[PDB]
From Swiss-Prot, chains A, B, D:
Active site: 53
Listed pathway(s): Cofactor biosynthesis; riboflavin biosynthesis; 5-amino-6-(D-ribitylamino)uracil from GTP: step 2/4; Cofactor biosynthesis; riboflavin biosynthesis; 5-amino-6-(D-ribitylamino)uracil from GTP: step 3/4
EC number: 3.5.4.26, 1.1.1.193
Record-linked Gene3D superfamilies: Cytidine Deaminase, domain 2, Dihydrofolate Reductase, subunit A
List of residues binding Zn(2+): 51, 76, 85
Annotated cofactor note: Binds 1 zinc ion.
Encoding gene (name): ribD
Segments forming domain CMP/dCMP-type deaminase: 3-124
Natural source organism: Bacillus subtilis (strain 168)
GO biological process: riboflavin biosynthetic process
Protein name (Swiss-Prot/TrEMBL): Riboflavin biosynthesis protein RibD
Assembly notes: Homotetramer.
Curated annotation (Swiss-Prot), chain C:
Gene, per the UniProt record: ribD
Name of the protein: Riboflavin biosynthesis protein RibD
Required co-factors: Zn(2+)
Residues binding substrate, per UniProt: 168, 184, 204, 207, 291
Active site: 52 (proton donor)
Cofactor: binding comment: Binds 1 zinc ion.
Family annotation (InterPro entries): APOBEC/CMP_deaminase_Zn-bd, CMP_dCMP_dom, Cytidine_deaminase-like, DHFR-like_dom_sf, Eubact_RibD, RibD_C, RibDG_C, Riboflavin_Biosynth_HTPR
Binding site for NADP(+): 154, 170, 196, 200, 222, 293-299
Subunit annotation: Homotetramer.
Segments for region (Deaminase): 2-145
Tagged with keyword Lyase: no
Species name: Bacillus subtilis (strain 168)
Residues at which Zn(2+) binds: 50, 75, 84
Pfam families per the UniProt record, alphabetical: dCMP_cyt_deam_1, RibD_C
Amino acid sequence: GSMEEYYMKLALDLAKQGEGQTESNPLVGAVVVKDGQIVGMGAHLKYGEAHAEVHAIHMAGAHAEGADIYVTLEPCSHYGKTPPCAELIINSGIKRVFVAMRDPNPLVAGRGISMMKEAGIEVREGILADQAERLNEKFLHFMRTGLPYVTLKAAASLDGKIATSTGDSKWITSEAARQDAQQYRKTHQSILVGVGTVKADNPSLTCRLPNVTKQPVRVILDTVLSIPEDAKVICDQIAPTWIFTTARADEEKKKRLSAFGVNIFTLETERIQIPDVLKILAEEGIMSVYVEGGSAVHGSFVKEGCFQEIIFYFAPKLIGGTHAPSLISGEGFQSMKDVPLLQFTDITQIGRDIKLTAKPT
Amino acid sequence: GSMEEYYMKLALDLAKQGEGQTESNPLVGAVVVKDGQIVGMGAHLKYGEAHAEVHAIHMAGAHAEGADIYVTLEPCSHYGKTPPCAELIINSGIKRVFVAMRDPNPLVAGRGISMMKEAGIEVREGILADQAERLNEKFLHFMRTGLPYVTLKAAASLDGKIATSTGDSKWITSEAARQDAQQYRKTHQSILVGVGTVKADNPSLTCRLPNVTKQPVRVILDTVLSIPEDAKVICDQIAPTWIFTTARADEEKKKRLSAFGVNIFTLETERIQIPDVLKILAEEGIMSVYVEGGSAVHGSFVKEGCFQEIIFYFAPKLIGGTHAPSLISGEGFQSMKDVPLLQFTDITQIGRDIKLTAKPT
Amino acid sequence: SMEEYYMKLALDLAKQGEGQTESNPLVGAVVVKDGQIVGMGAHLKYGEAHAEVHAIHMAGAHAEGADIYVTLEPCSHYGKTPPCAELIINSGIKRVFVAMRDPNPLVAGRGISMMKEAGIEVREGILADQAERLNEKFLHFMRTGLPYVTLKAAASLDGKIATSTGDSKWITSEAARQDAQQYRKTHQSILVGVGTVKADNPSLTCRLPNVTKQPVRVILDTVLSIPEDAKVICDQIAPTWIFTTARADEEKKKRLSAFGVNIFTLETERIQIPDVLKILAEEGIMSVYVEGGSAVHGSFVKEGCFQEIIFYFAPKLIGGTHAPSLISGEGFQSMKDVPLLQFTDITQIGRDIKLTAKPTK
Amino acid sequence: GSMEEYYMKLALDLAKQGEGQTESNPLVGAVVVKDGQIVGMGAHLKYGEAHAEVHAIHMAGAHAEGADIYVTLEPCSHYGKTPPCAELIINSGIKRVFVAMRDPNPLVAGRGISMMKEAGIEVREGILADQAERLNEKFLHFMRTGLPYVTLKAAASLDGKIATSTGDSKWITSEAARQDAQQYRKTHQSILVGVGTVKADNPSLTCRLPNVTKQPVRVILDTVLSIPEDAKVICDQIAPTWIFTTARADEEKKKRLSAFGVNIFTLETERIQIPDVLKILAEEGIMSVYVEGGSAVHGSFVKEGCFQEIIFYFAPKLIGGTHAPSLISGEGFQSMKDVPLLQFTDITQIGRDIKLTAKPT
Ligand SMILES: Nc1c(/N=C/[C@H](O)[C@H](O)[C@H](O)COP(=O)(O)O)[nH]c(=O)[nH]c1=O
Ligand SMILES: Nc1c(/N=C/[C@H](O)[C@H](O)[C@H](O)COP(=O)(O)O)[nH]c(=O)[nH]c1=O
Ligand SMILES: Nc1c(/N=C/[C@H](O)[C@H](O)[C@H](O)COP(=O)(O)O)[nH]c(=O)[nH]c1=O
Ligand SMILES: Nc1c(/N=C/[C@H](O)[C@H](O)[C@H](O)COP(=O)(O)O)[nH]c(=O)[nH]c1=O
Ligand SMILES: Nc1c(N[C@@H]2O[C@H](COP(=O)(O)O)[C@@H](O)[C@H]2O)[nH]c(=O)[nH]c1=O
Ligand SMILES: Nc1c(N[C@@H]2O[C@H](COP(=O)(O)O)[C@@H](O)[C@H]2O)[nH]c(=O)[nH]c1=O
Ligand SMILES: Nc1c(N[C@@H]2O[C@H](COP(=O)(O)O)[C@@H](O)[C@H]2O)[nH]c(=O)[nH]c1=O
Ligand SMILES: [Zn+2]
Ligand SMILES: [Zn+2]
Ligand SMILES: [Zn+2]
Ligand SMILES: [Zn+2]
């Protein structure tokens, strides 16, 4: 093993400790070494609070002076919700710093390294950038593309059906699978679904796990605003509800809905385009979207190539039926030469079910 | 551990040396031990020829006197193509017999143990029973139930499509996967497909893997003989071809295909009944069937509940589209409370694709 | 179990302070609030903030109502600053998880009761074994009052530490000697009899990639016949302490003191191991890595003063009736008087085999 | 991964089944393959009985005509206890022959391969020669060197003492490891010790494992024939007892013992030389010798380099004692550069003891 590597490693593991506590902020670890001895360690633990460097340097005490510091992400240079870390590093008299990777965030891009270099501080980057990458996939993708990180999820029988030819779907996959699916209602800032789902299952789309601290944004794709006005996603006040329609939506009805706190987004088109929906979500602050329902909705996402992750749960059952609804509705790909290739990322059993996850290639 | 278990293990390993050589006969092994030494070893190597016991007892010679013998399957007691092995055992002076499991057929079951018990021989049962069962899974099924061991095989995209909405399916699963499937055209006595597949692809349905001892019987399902005599099995019958048709199956055709070697069967009904087909083959000495033909065919087998194994190859590809052929078509179950629950027995990544195999409860 | 997850994190945090705490034990601490990790800490510098202090300070306001996991009983005495148990009480923490109690019989349980008395819930035992391993040597020193002793020896497969001519330069491999180097990092002192210094003139220094400190080199030299030009007396690389008796020459002791050598004069005719151990403890040496000295080893064994024994065997055979064996000296008279040890580990390093054993109770 | 070597692996496995029934004869296996099918199998199961090729060809019946045969050893062409199998192969109609390795008996070797080739049989050879070599390690050694295959076994403390300075040896290693030691008194044709080991233990050197059959030859090294007139070996009558002595052997006493069944070999040297006794022993048919003698005896064997294998049993104990006897005494090597390098073969714990086995390189 290496020594500069052991330190960046410790920083990555320190980073993991904030997983799911930092909301929109990324996971970050910081470890200060002075005279070959660890004197400070830190991690971003809570959104809106001290960053990793702040904790590490404050712990470092007076050994901060002339010491080294390893950060999994480049020290921020902006005056946002927290003061600049780059500034804290230079004002604490840190000799040299090691950054695993640059913060793609528009208002920090490379700016944090320049701010420390011009102050004489030696900056080195690259150490374990691969794992630093695996640490904040969503945040990163969002900062680099401007579009939310999209995950598509569906449950189905082993022969690919999502219900019988009569629409029965009461028990396709076990409770263990459903419970596993709930994790995603936490790693994602929003749950996305078509109104067909609301009309059919009148879901709560809210997370029913333990660490309830910030319900996810519930997005509804409703082309002609036919959503039932009595629906949970409208009269439960449990979480933010955003609906996307077109000019074909009824003005009066549209006024009644916002009266309940629902935020409507009227698209200047005839058929809700997925790409416009994503861009708008990104612009409102949504960094991740968990697309749960609408085989047609999944179809639009798959056809336009707007997904980073695909997650299917297969049950050891066979539904059959020529007219039984399949996993992906909509247009579809004409011939094989046009169908995109994906790669399986994880195959794991959950109860009696199988969970296959794949990603674009 | 146990020495008894070692001998039975050895017998089991000897039995396998005849795989794919014993035809309809089950694999069987035997080892004779005298005064703690191995003096005889044997297995069934050729159909219609000596059984394991005949080989082992011969090799043992005078050592068979007062010795023990371990056999994987109950020693025959009838008069097929070899005199009763129980008699051979009795007259060799063998004192004790270790039997893994009894004979499948309900009429000849235990008749062997009884004879030997009558002659004063000690018969022990159960040692490595489970492994003996796996060695002749299909055979044991045939005898025990009176019907073929059915295996349904299919390959589809991750979203369960057998082809694009425009019939294209030229590239779904990897060649490595297509290759892994060939191992089934070797372990099954028959391969079954529907005429739909015949005219759509014009398959050979022949085992290409290195072993070429005999040709899996090519069973085709037709209803009116729309099968293009212009190709496939018809032309150059590399192996036996059997077609199941219905009364209204023309006349000049029915007696025209018999002109080659095609054995045409004709069902009474107007609707080809699966349970009738499996019974017909069971009569024809076919002990196992490998079904890969059309989604409809699989649908029938599934609705009828006539299958012991399901093997699905999933490619990391999303074909999508409504009207894109799915894995199983036809009737299917309308109520989710009527969908039979199966169990996954093996997950295996093959090339880029995933191989799922489930068996019924 | 989240309990174990948090203690494990506290344990891993404690490790970061290895070799940086002098006589202070390694300790980790993590503060959890509403299911979230809000504070982390470990003792990193001798004479500086304890783990509980870093963790609690990081937790900030979140400490109120929070949970804290600590690998060792929080101190409870009143020195320059408030004890850690008092800190916890003040911060508003409602539950404490302690892996193990203070080793000092006079303090054990003191911090616990101090915290319960303030209405705080205290749970003990979580990962005690690991918390025990973390400070093994420290714990032993604190419990018995003597240093933790490891005896190490390299020898041919037949028990010889050199040929009959004294030739021993490399019986074991480079890899094996490099491995043994590790114990020079984990012990505060390395010990040998003068014989080793006369025969091999070793430096007895720790030459690992990272060495912020050198272990005290202790020499047992009855008559003070050590060569004044030996490395241990001239390299100035590490402290060198010698134990002699009254037979030692005063002017020589003066010459050696001028070189920085620490000489202890025992009031006995022979050097007693129990006395040197006692004097080393009085000087603060909690661990001793004993190598050179078949006679030295013999004394440590006959007196029963070792906690662990490590033998490196080489795939070699050196004969010799006069070749030196592993443990010279008196030895046990009868096989019923020989204490039974227990193999703790068996590993192969390069072409050699490393065996470690510890006595039994 | 080829069928070519699968068949040979099989033959090897078949041959393994006669282990410890072969006696002097080597374990051999044969597989007859006709038109891609295993039609016959065999192995040498009993001494003086049929060779592998016999059983296999018989079982192959008429399928032997124009078939192949894989043998783990060159088919014998001489008339020993049974006729020539090479003759058999030919007269059977078999055309190809795969031999794994040629015969060791120089005069009796080569012929087989030649005898066959002379009949038009294509003889390929070398397949799995590696495995075939370990199968009969001792046998091949004896035939290739004319010397017995030697094994040195010893049981000592972890510090290399085989007794206390009092001579007390009342069990260093556990009974479990003592029983593990018995296995060798079953696989070696003779067990050897020095007279010292007799007039200080009066062992019987007899075997005590189920199915004892023949009892190994007991060889004693007695320089002056001072062996006690009454000793379990002299008068037990359990097993043969050979003694090697010199000129200084009392003629009277020599005669007495000869009347008791003891065969005496007098050497014309002043001291007994291992190479001479190993030469005599081979001449008398002894192919292997288990040496547990004494440290002096082991020293002689090591010094001469007269051993193929060394097995040491170490107990989790420290005996100590500068005068306690060591593992290998005698002259031994003066310089580490002179010391021969061995290689660790196997490391296995037996109860609380450790069993090390090594071989010269
Ligand atoms: N039918 C199945 C699923 N289907 C469930 C529906 O998608 C349903 O709309 C959501 O679970 C509603 O979320 P909630 O009311 O807010 O807790 N999901 C599964 O994982 N397996 C199945 O078998
Ligand atoms: N289209 C695919 C499959 N398609 C299977 C079809 O039924 C096809 O007609 C038969 O496999 C043809 O057999 P033959 O080699 O001509 O004798 N099967 C697969 O495992 N993967 C696919 O992509
Ligand atoms: N004789 C052998 C050993 N001998 C150990 C002696 O005590 C030797 O003086 C020290 O290891 C020298 O250490 P230094 O590098 O000068 O600081 N130790 C080993 O690991 N293998 C052997 O063969
Ligand atoms: N002393 C020990 C051994 N002692 C080995 C001696 O060679 C001893 O004479 C023989 O094992 C005696 O066998 P028998 O009485 O003739 O059946 N061998 C061991 O493996 N462990 C020990 O502790
Ligand atoms: N969490 C984190 C960083 N976060 C960077 O700062 C943004 C958050 O800024 P703020 O509004 O002040 O909280 C986020 O967008 C990211 O680009 N930087 C590094 O200093 N170390 C840290 O631990
Ligand atoms: N092959 C085999 C057995 N086969 C038993 O006999 C049937 C075959 O009978 P036969 O027509 O005479 O070959 C098969 O149905 C099974 O129940 N029995 C055991 O004696 N040992 C053997 O090796
Ligand atoms: N056991 C064995 C062979 N044994 C070879 O024959 C010798 C034994 O001869 P015999 O005295 O007749 O049993 C032995 O020295 C070995 O070299 N040869 C091969 O034919 N196949 C066999 O299975
Ligand atoms: Zn910052
Ligand atoms: Zn039979
Ligand atoms: Zn404290
Ligand atoms: Zn032969």
